[PDB]
Amino acid sequence: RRPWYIQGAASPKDMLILVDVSGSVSGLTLKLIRTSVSEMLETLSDDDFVNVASFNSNAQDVSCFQHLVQANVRNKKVLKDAVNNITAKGITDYKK
């Protein structure tokens, strides 16, 4: 998980994180999903671009961002705080 290791292990990334917020994920798996997405965001640096979306019968951006952003400490802060506000309700639609 060190920046130097992650830098020398692979090339930059265009990551999109798609988080399921249907009702079935409510409870323990939602709490684990929030912790998991924060940990996943911590393996990203300033040469990677990220956005976190969300879907349950309708897909939307989890944040204010609306496209891929540079994944610096401020943008990752925005995305982590937007992910911690996630709730679970609805039907699942993997196609949307």
């Binding site: 249907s22 009702g23 079935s24 409870g27 679970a88 609805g90």
Partner: protein, 48 residues
């Protein structure tokens, strides 16, 4: 007066399985089998 009572207690046993295979899910979620058995309810409701 016909054997119209073993037809009825054998579709009463069919509505006992359309209740057992139903999977209850949280916060307003479903699957395909759950939505199929909400069609069988109309059948059982127009037979009884």
């Amino acid at each position: 007066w016909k054997p119209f009572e073993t037809i009825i207690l054998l579709t009463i046993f069919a509505n006992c399985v359309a209740l057992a295979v139903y999977l209850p899910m949280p916060e307003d979620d479903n699957n395909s089998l759950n939505l199929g058995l909400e069609k069988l309810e109309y059948f059982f409701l127009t037979v009884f």
